Design a protein around this motif. Structure first.
Motif, short mmCIF file in Angstrom:
data_model
loop_
_atom_site.label_atom_id
_atom_site.label_comp_id
_atom_site.label_asym_id
_atom_site.label_seq_id
_atom_site.Cartn_x
_atom_site.Cartn_y
_atom_site.Cartn_z
N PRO A 1 20.16 43.13 36.99
CA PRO A 1 19.96 44.29 36.31
C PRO A 1 19.14 43.95 35.02
CG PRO A 1 22.17 43.82 35.99
CD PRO A 1 21.60 42.79 37.11
N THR A 2 18.37 44.93 34.50
CA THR A 2 17.83 44.93 33.39
C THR A 2 18.82 44.93 32.41
OG1 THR A 2 17.39 47.27 33.18
CG2 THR A 2 15.71 46.09 33.99
N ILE A 3 18.68 44.72 31.13
CA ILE A 3 19.58 44.61 30.11
C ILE A 3 19.91 46.13 30.00
CG2 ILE A 3 19.99 44.59 27.67
CD1 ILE A 3 20.74 42.02 29.03
N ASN A 4 18.71 46.93 29.78
CA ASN A 4 18.94 48.43 29.53
C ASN A 4 19.94 48.85 30.57
OD1 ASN A 4 17.33 50.53 27.96
ND2 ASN A 4 17.47 51.21 30.08
N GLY B 1 13.30 44.79 24.54
CA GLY B 1 14.29 45.35 25.57
C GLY B 1 15.25 44.04 25.46
N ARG B 2 15.78 43.68 24.46
CA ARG B 2 17.02 42.80 24.03
C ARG B 2 16.25 41.76 23.10
NH1 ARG B 2 20.86 40.09 23.69
NH2 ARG B 2 22.42 39.39 25.00
N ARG B 3 16.07 42.05 21.63
CA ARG B 3 15.71 41.54 20.51
C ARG B 3 16.74 40.50 20.31
NH1 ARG B 3 10.63 43.69 21.26
NH2 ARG B 3 9.09 42.41 20.13
N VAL B 4 16.44 39.38 19.88
CA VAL B 4 17.67 38.20 19.32
C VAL B 4 17.47 37.75 17.96
CG1 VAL B 4 18.32 35.96 19.61
CG2 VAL B 4 17.84 37.35 21.80
N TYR B 5 18.27 38.27 17.36
CA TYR B 5 18.24 38.13 15.61
C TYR B 5 19.36 36.99 15.47
CZ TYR B 5 15.06 42.25 15.70
OH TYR B 5 14.26 42.88 16.09
N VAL B 6 19.00 36.11 14.57
CA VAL B 6 20.18 35.13 14.04
C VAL B 6 20.08 34.83 12.58
CG1 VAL B 6 20.21 33.81 16.18
CG2 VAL B 6 18.45 33.52 14.55
N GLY B 7 21.29 34.93 12.13
CA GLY B 7 21.79 34.69 10.76
C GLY B 7 21.30 33.16 10.61
N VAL B 8 21.28 32.85 9.04
CA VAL B 8 20.98 31.23 8.83
C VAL B 8 21.97 30.27 9.37
CG1 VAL B 8 22.06 31.15 6.73
CG2 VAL B 8 19.96 30.04 7.17
N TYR C 1 25.48 43.47 24.60
CA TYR C 1 24.13 43.09 25.21
C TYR C 1 23.18 42.85 24.12
CZ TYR C 1 27.14 44.36 29.16
OH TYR C 1 28.07 44.49 30.16
N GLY C 2 23.50 43.20 22.94
CA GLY C 2 22.27 42.95 21.91
C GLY C 2 21.32 44.01 21.67
N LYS C 3 20.56 44.22 22.70
CA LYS C 3 19.62 45.16 22.70
C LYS C 3 19.92 46.35 21.87
CE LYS C 3 17.33 47.61 25.80
NZ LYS C 3 16.25 48.61 25.72
N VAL C 4 18.88 46.40 20.74
CA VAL C 4 19.39 47.59 19.75
C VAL C 4 19.12 48.78 20.48
CG1 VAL C 4 16.93 47.24 18.93
CG2 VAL C 4 18.59 48.69 17.48
#
Ligand SMILES: CN[C@@H]1[C@@H](O[C@H]2O[C@H](CO)[C@@H](N)[C@H](O)[C@H]2O)O[C@H]2C[C@@H](N)[C@@H](O[C@H]3[C@H](O)[C@@H](O)[C@H](N)C[C@@H]3N)O[C@@H]2[C@@H]1O
Ligand SMILES: [K+]
Ligand SMILES: [K+]
Ligand SMILES: [K+]
Ligand SMILES: [K+]
Ligand SMILES: [K+]
Ligand SMILES: [K+]
Ligand SMILES: [K+]
Ligand SMILES: [K+]
Ligand SMILES: [K+]
Ligand SMILES: [K+]
Ligand SMILES: [K+]
Ligand SMILES: [Mg+2]
Ligand SMILES: [Mg+2]
Ligand SMILES: [Mg+2]
Ligand SMILES: [Mg+2]
Ligand SMILES: [Mg+2]
Ligand SMILES: [Mg+2]
Ligand SMILES: [Mg+2]
Ligand SMILES: [Mg+2]
Ligand SMILES: [Mg+2]
Ligand SMILES: [Mg+2]
Ligand SMILES: [Mg+2]
Ligand SMILES: [Mg+2]
Ligand SMILES: [Mg+2]
Ligand SMILES: [Mg+2]
Ligand SMILES: [Mg+2]
Ligand SMILES: [Mg+2]
Ligand SMILES: [Mg+2]
Ligand SMILES: [Mg+2]
Ligand SMILES: [Mg+2]
Ligand SMILES: [Mg+2]
Ligand SMILES: [Mg+2]
Ligand SMILES: [Mg+2]
Ligand SMILES: [Mg+2]
Ligand SMILES: [Mg+2]
Ligand SMILES: [Mg+2]
Ligand SMILES: [Mg+2]
Ligand SMILES: [Mg+2]
Ligand SMILES: [Mg+2]
Ligand SMILES: [Mg+2]
Ligand SMILES: [Mg+2]
Ligand SMILES: [Mg+2]
Ligand SMILES: [Mg+2]
Ligand SMILES: [Mg+2]
Ligand SMILES: [Mg+2]
Ligand SMILES: [Mg+2]
Ligand SMILES: [Mg+2]
Ligand SMILES: [Mg+2]
Ligand SMILES: [Mg+2]
Ligand SMILES: [Mg+2]
Ligand SMILES: [Mg+2]
Ligand SMILES: [Mg+2]
Ligand SMILES: [Mg+2]
Ligand SMILES: [Mg+2]
Ligand SMILES: [Mg+2]
Ligand SMILES: [Mg+2]
Ligand SMILES: [Mg+2]
Ligand SMILES: [Mg+2]
Ligand SMILES: [Mg+2]
Ligand SMILES: [Mg+2]
Ligand SMILES: [Mg+2]
Ligand SMILES: [Mg+2]
Ligand SMILES: [Mg+2]
Ligand SMILES: [Mg+2]
Ligand SMILES: [Mg+2]
Ligand SMILES: [Mg+2]
Ligand SMILES: [Mg+2]
Ligand SMILES: [Mg+2]
Ligand SMILES: [Mg+2]
Ligand SMILES: [Mg+2]
Ligand SMILES: [Mg+2]
Ligand SMILES: [Mg+2]
Ligand SMILES: [Mg+2]
Ligand SMILES: [Mg+2]
Ligand SMILES: [Mg+2]
Ligand SMILES: [Mg+2]
Ligand SMILES: [Mg+2]
Ligand SMILES: [Mg+2]
Ligand SMILES: [Mg+2]
Ligand SMILES: [Mg+2]
Ligand SMILES: [Mg+2]
Ligand SMILES: [Mg+2]
Ligand SMILES: [Mg+2]
Ligand SMILES: [Mg+2]
Ligand SMILES: [Mg+2]
Ligand SMILES: [Mg+2]
Ligand SMILES: [Mg+2]
Ligand SMILES: [Mg+2]
Ligand SMILES: [Zn+2]
Lengths: 124, 138, 99, 208, 83, 104
Positions: free
Chosen positions: A1-4, B90-97, F31-34
RNA sequence: UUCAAA
RNA sequence: GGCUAAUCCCCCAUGUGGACCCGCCCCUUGGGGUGUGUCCAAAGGGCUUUGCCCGCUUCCGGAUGGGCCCGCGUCCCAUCAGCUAGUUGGUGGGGUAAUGGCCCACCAAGGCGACGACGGGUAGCCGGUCUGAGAGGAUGGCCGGCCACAGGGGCACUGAGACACGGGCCCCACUCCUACGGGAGGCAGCAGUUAGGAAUCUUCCGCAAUGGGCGCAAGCCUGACGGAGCGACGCCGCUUGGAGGAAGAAGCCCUUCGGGGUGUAAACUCCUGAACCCGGGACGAAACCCCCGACGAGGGGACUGACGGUACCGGGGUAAUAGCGCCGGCCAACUCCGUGCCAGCAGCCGCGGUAAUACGGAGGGCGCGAGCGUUACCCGGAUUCACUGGGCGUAAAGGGCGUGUAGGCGGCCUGGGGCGUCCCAUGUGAAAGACCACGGCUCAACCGUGGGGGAGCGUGGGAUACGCUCAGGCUAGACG
């Protein structure tokens, strides 16, 4: 499934269906007997396995298997149930704990005596 | 449209290499260029030129492989045996240092974007910062 | 049985009674003061009021009204009485009112 | 109570001669001495290729019977060693070692470990003074393990200790046959041991 | 009314207390406002009784009524020596 | 620090009051996605000043009425009725999804 | 017909 | 009906000071100050006696505790999609310590919902606990923090505080005295009884310690608490011997009747002494008090132990309980007999119909050992709801096909902002717990002391690549 979709719908948890609903999941439950017939096994087996329609304190009426080679159970004998499928004879999902209440333990049993509730032979 | 520009380039690259091509072009985007600077400086790609195909800004990337081999399949070894996109729309990935991944016991990089510019994992861990984990490579 | 903490119940009743009284008195003069101010009789309008400010404050002395409760009651009273004498009034008696 | 029954029987189920009786387990007759095959009316019969588990199961029992310890006790130590810092396999070893009932035998005041245990549980031992009847009791480095004054003069201690004079000991142990003292210098390294056991397996047995 | 007292943190036949600041209404061993020392009624250790002297001399400056035993220990540590 | 939030007046039909819609972006916990998520607060408009469409800064205030613990602090930008649209249209969307369908 | 059994 | 005291109640006065209206300043939601007017105080008791002590009154501040409000987070059912009149807001007003539809009067149409309203179901929440490589899942007993309730349903009274578990009133159900007119009563306090249940304790000792109430103190009350008691329910420590001992008793089992097993096992030789007996026998307890000093620092001395004659120490001293599961494969361990699809076994695959390593007994063996099994439930293995970490041509899985609403997602370049993102500093993250190091019980379990971390959120400062937004430009997408 999409993340959404997951964020929208989400994954679904799987609940476990108990195999022994003779209530409260209580380890054991007691009941009085009713019928104490014998039954034929499922294929490919044969014999006259001993069963018993028990009227439980949990309000249910289930048929429990009587282990051991000989029993002294009649009409209104009270007995303790304990769950345990009996692979063959379907419909039977519980066992009769022996050595508790009007269900004496098997006699002359010398091996796995812990089950079948037989005291330890005093041994002379 | 062209859904995700970077993920596109990382692929045009991936594909162009499995067929062992000389180079391969890609639409020109500064961010893409900055990404290349990293691929360049790391010995993954012999480098990139700013060629203009059809009168539209492109980015000719020159790929690098290994040396011919023994036995069946004499095909060279890839320098880039892996380049997977991470933070995708549609799912960004952000990381701390302190959550910047050690890419394969350090034998690979991890082009990530910080507000101090686009740097590799080592680079940004040095500068002590985090950001959008653009991708990984090894 | 028996709990000689009945002496407590006993007492509350005796107290409940004292309070109930002081209160009724306050409320009565308050009303009675507003009645006159709202009739332009600035004479005994203040006199009764000033004589209720004390009844209030005093009630607060012990444990009947206490604190802000008395404060409020007084505020509410002096307010009504002033703006109600806004009908040719002119706080004659002066009373609890900075004219 | 730690086991307590036929010993020169396990000796011959581990195929290795576990000197679990001290003397006699040392001199021609350890049972393993002329009857190496397993006990029971099936010992001499050929053996089937032991399973991966089968093996680690013995390799553990071997190690565990060597110290005559209970599974209940054996587990804790291992789990403790698994937590402690450093190579769990050795640390486990040098810990089994730090047991009084063992260091006592390691020092010789008693021939075997079974006997070495009885000495402790009967008050015949002192750690830096003050009696100690805890076989398990941890022996830390520097601690001196002597024989109670009130027992230095005992029929057994004599022979056993007399028998020492000359015979040396581990590069971590030091004696003093005189007043019947002894000191725990160092915690034995895997190297310092000559155990007929591949500890590596016993790890892989709980790592199950 | 806050008090400086003891909170038994021992075990069966192995008492250990904690000198503490706390509203007298809390249960003996409950949440306290601050720990300012610890007494070991059996001197099982060379250091069986320590007590922050500054903090003590302070809670006292605002109320902290010390129970009798609390006082004794605070005393036997110079909380009150005014030389 | 009395919490100050920024939003858009989507209702002025109340007396001395306004409905302020406030959005809040953030990474989804699993799921992270904001994702965007919003809530509306009923702010206090003392002198029926701020009108529909404005963008205001709401501040944590002392209770004024059951459900209404915020006063309108000041105005950032004015009457951008484009935002109010995303809103009204959504509510108007609800029109369907009922018993006898609805309309797109 | 049933259950096996190479 | 009558008499009476006070630290009971009241009136007048003095007023540091405090309360209220108005005006004016400073502050900024109701904070502080001013100037007229008004309003409000108080017991007394003890003495080692014109001096101290325990109290009293009006203030201000401190400290502790508590109301209230707000952001964010906190279960299942959409085979619950519409919900709402105190409902949503207003103006006055009542109520309170205080804001508030908290309640009332009048006015206005409003408020909530797919970001799941409303209805139904389940549930006290948390620190933590179990499990897991982690992410995550499952839990919330004991201990600590919040909350709620005290037979069910309503109330208010007193009071700093309650809408009161062992206080009050009323209604309902039930129980017990009744002269039948009426009365009395709430163990979900400690014990205990009975019922239900597979199942959960002594109608114990003590106030010595710590803690709480009242008291100047002595002291009194304390089923809080500190200890015993019962229960292998759990964790930890410990015994039921140790060292010798036959080319290997007997009895059992097997056997190609040579021989093999139990078996160094026993017998037996010596050795140490759980149990038990004698004697000694405590920490936990030094304050309150009394005297000197000054009712202060400081010094001095007297009381005081339930546990318990127990723990522990010294001496004497007997060889001094073992079981339960399992052995066809997974799965560590084989043979003889008895059975004959019978009797029975069985966690899954499966065994028994005349030679059964699977049934029942026996010899032997494996596992663990004061425990060993069975049943029930939780996590794991299970990347078997896959965020980390799955899939959908034929295995389960692409909607019959479009159109397009909400929503998700957006090409190249430049600026501004700094919501997302990132960084530093700081506040917080209670105690217990987990981790590390020391230390106390002979170890350990258990306990003590100290220490290092930590997600999350608040605050101050900073970065601007990517995402977002505002403002321009572009033509490679799209449309013409
Ligand atoms: C004289 N009372 C005994 C007590 O004595 C010991 O502790 C006391 C504490 O004050 C001391 N005064 C005394 O000197 C000391 O020897 O030890 C406990 C040990 C406990 N596991 C249990 O065992 C029983 C088991 O639990 C049970 O299963 C078994 N059948 C019988 C056991 N006695 O109950 C006894 C019993 O309470
Ligand atoms: K609607
Ligand atoms: K009378
Ligand atoms: K005060
Ligand atoms: K507060
Ligand atoms: K109102
Ligand atoms: K929960
Ligand atoms: K036969
Ligand atoms: K059998
Ligand atoms: K499972
Ligand atoms: K289909
Ligand atoms: K259809
Ligand atoms: Mg059941
Ligand atoms: Mg069959
Ligand atoms: Mg089962
Ligand atoms: Mg690749
Ligand atoms: Mg990822
Ligand atoms: Mg009284
Ligand atoms: Mg009247
Ligand atoms: Mg280790
Ligand atoms: Mg209002
Ligand atoms: Mg036919
Ligand atoms: Mg068949
Ligand atoms: Mg076949
Ligand atoms: Mg009278
Ligand atoms: Mg005055
Ligand atoms: Mg004055
Ligand atoms: Mg003023
Ligand atoms: Mg006066
Ligand atoms: Mg007077
Ligand atoms: Mg009075
Ligand atoms: Mg309402
Ligand atoms: Mg008010
Ligand atoms: Mg109002
Ligand atoms: Mg409930
Ligand atoms: Mg996993
Ligand atoms: Mg949790
Ligand atoms: Mg309970
Ligand atoms: Mg609790
Ligand atoms: Mg109730
Ligand atoms: Mg009840
Ligand atoms: Mg009631
Ligand atoms: Mg009630
Ligand atoms: Mg009071
Ligand atoms: Mg009151
Ligand atoms: Mg009460
Ligand atoms: Mg009540
Ligand atoms: Mg209440
Ligand atoms: Mg009660
Ligand atoms: Mg009770
Ligand atoms: Mg019953
Ligand atoms: Mg108990
Ligand atoms: Mg007491
Ligand atoms: Mg006391
Ligand atoms: Mg009493
Ligand atoms: Mg008593
Ligand atoms: Mg208790
Ligand atoms: Mg022997
Ligand atoms: Mg002797
Ligand atoms: Mg003492
Ligand atoms: Mg003492
Ligand atoms: Mg006393
Ligand atoms: Mg004097
Ligand atoms: Mg003194
Ligand atoms: Mg096997
Ligand atoms: Mg069986
Ligand atoms: Mg037949
Ligand atoms: Mg037949
Ligand atoms: Mg089997
Ligand atoms: Mg045990
Ligand atoms: Mg899983
Ligand atoms: Mg996935
Ligand atoms: Mg997932
Ligand atoms: Mg699959
Ligand atoms: Mg098909
Ligand atoms: Mg299919
Ligand atoms: Mg199709
Ligand atoms: Mg659209
Ligand atoms: Mg759209
Ligand atoms: Mg873009
Ligand atoms: Mg967008
Ligand atoms: Mg921009
Ligand atoms: Mg920002
Ligand atoms: Mg922080
Ligand atoms: Mg903690
Ligand atoms: Mg130690
Ligand atoms: Mg600690
Ligand atoms: Mg830029
Ligand atoms: Mg533009
Ligand atoms: Zn041997």
């Amino acid at each position: 499934p999409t993340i959404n979709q997951l964020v929208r719908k989400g994954r679904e948890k799987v609940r476990k269906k108990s195999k022994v609903p003779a209530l409260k999941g209580a380890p054991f439950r007691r009941g009085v007997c009713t019928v104490v017939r014998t039954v034929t096994p499922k294929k490919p087996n044969s014999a006259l396995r001993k069963v018993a329609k028990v009227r439980l304190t949990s309000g249910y009426e289930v048929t429990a298997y009587i282990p051991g080679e000989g029993h002294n159970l009649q009409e209104h004998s009270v007995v303790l149930i304990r769950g345990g499928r009996v692979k063959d004879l379907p419909g039977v999902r519980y066992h009769i704990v022996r050595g508790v209440y009007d269900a004496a333990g098997v006699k002359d049993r010398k091996k796995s005596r812990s089950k079948y509730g037989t005291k330890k032979p005093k041994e002379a | 449209m062209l859904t995700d520009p970077i993920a596109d380039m990382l692929t045009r690259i991936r594909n162009a290499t499995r067929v062992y091509k000389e180079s391969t072009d890609v639409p020109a985007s500064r961010f893409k260029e900055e990404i290349l600077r990293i691929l360049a400086r790391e010995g993954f790609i012999k480098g990139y030129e700013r060629v203009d195909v059809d009168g539209k800004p492109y980015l000719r990337v020159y790929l690098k492989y290994g040396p011919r081999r023994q036995g069946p399949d004499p095909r060279p070894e890839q320098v880039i045996h892996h380049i997977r996109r991470i933070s995708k729309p549609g799912r960004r990935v952000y990381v701390g240092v302190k959550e910047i991944p050690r890419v394969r016991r350090g034998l690979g990089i991890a082009i990530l974007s910080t507000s101090k510019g686009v740097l590799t994992d080592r680079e940004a861990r040095k500068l002590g910062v985090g950001g959008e984990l653009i991708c990984e490579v090894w | 049985r028996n709990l000689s903490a009945l002496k407590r119940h006993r007492q509350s009743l005796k107290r409940r009674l004292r309070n109930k009284a002081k209160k009724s008195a306050i409320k009565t003069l308050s009303k009675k003061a507003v009645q006159l101010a709202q009739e332009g009789k600035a004479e005994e309008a203040l006199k009764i009021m000033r004589k209720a400010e004390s009844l209030i404050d005093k009630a607060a002395k012990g444990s009947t009204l206490h604190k802000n409760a008395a404060a409020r009651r007084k505020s509410r009273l002096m307010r009504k009485v002033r703006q109600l004498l806004e009908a040719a009034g002119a706080p004659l008696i002066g009373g609890g009112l900075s004219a | 109570g730690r086991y307590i029954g036929p010993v020169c029987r396990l000796c011959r189920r581990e195929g290795v001669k576990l000197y679990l009786k001290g003397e006699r387990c040392y001199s021609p007759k350890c049972a393993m001495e002329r009857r190496p095959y397993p006990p029971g009316q099936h010992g001499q019969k050929r053996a089937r290729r032991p399973s991966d588990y089968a093996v680690r199961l013995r390799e553990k029992q071997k190690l565990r019977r060597i110290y005559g310890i209970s599974e209940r006790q054996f587990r804790n130590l291992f789990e403790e060693a698994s937590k402690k810092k450093g190579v769990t396999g050795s640390v486990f070893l040098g810990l089994l070692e730090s047991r009084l009932d063992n260091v006592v035998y390691r020092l010789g005041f008693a021939v075997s470990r079974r006997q070495a245990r009885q000495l402790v549980r009967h008050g015949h031992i002192t750690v830096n003074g003050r009696r100690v009847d805890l076989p398990s009791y941890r022996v830390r480095p520097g601690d001196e393990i002597a024989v109670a004054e009130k027992s230095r003069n005992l029929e057994l201690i004599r022979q056993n200790l007399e028998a020492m004079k000359g015979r040396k000991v581990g590069p971590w142990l030091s004696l003093d046959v005189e007043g019947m003292k002894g000191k725990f210098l160092r915690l034995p390294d895997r190297e310092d041991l000559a155990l007929p056991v591949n500890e590596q397996l016993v790890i892989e047995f709980y790592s199950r | 009314m806050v008090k400086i007292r003891l909170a038994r943190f021992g075990s069966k036949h192995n008492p250990h207390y904690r000198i503490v600041v706390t509203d007298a209404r809390r249960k003996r061993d409950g949440k306290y406002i601050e720990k300012i020392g610890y007494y070991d009624p059996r001197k099982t250790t060379p250091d069986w009784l320590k007590v922050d002297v500054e903090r003590a001399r302070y809670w006292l400056s605002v109320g902290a009524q010390p129970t009798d035993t609390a006082r004794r220990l605070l005393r036997q540590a110079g909380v009150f020596r005014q030389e | 620090p009395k919490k100050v939030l920024t939003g858009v007046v989507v209702s002025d039909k109340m007396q001395k009051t306004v409905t302020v819609l406030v959005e809040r972006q953030f990474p989804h916990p699993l799921y992270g996605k904001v994702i965007k998520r919003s809530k509306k607060y009923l702010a206090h408009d003392p002198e029926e000043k701020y009108k529909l469409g404005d963008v205001v800064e709401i501040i944590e205030s002392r209770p004024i009425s059951k459900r209404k613990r915020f006063r309108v602090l000041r105005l950032v930008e004015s009457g951008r009725m484009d935002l109010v649209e995303k809103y009204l249209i959504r509510r108007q969307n609800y029109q369907s999804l009922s018993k006898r369908g609805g309309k797109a």
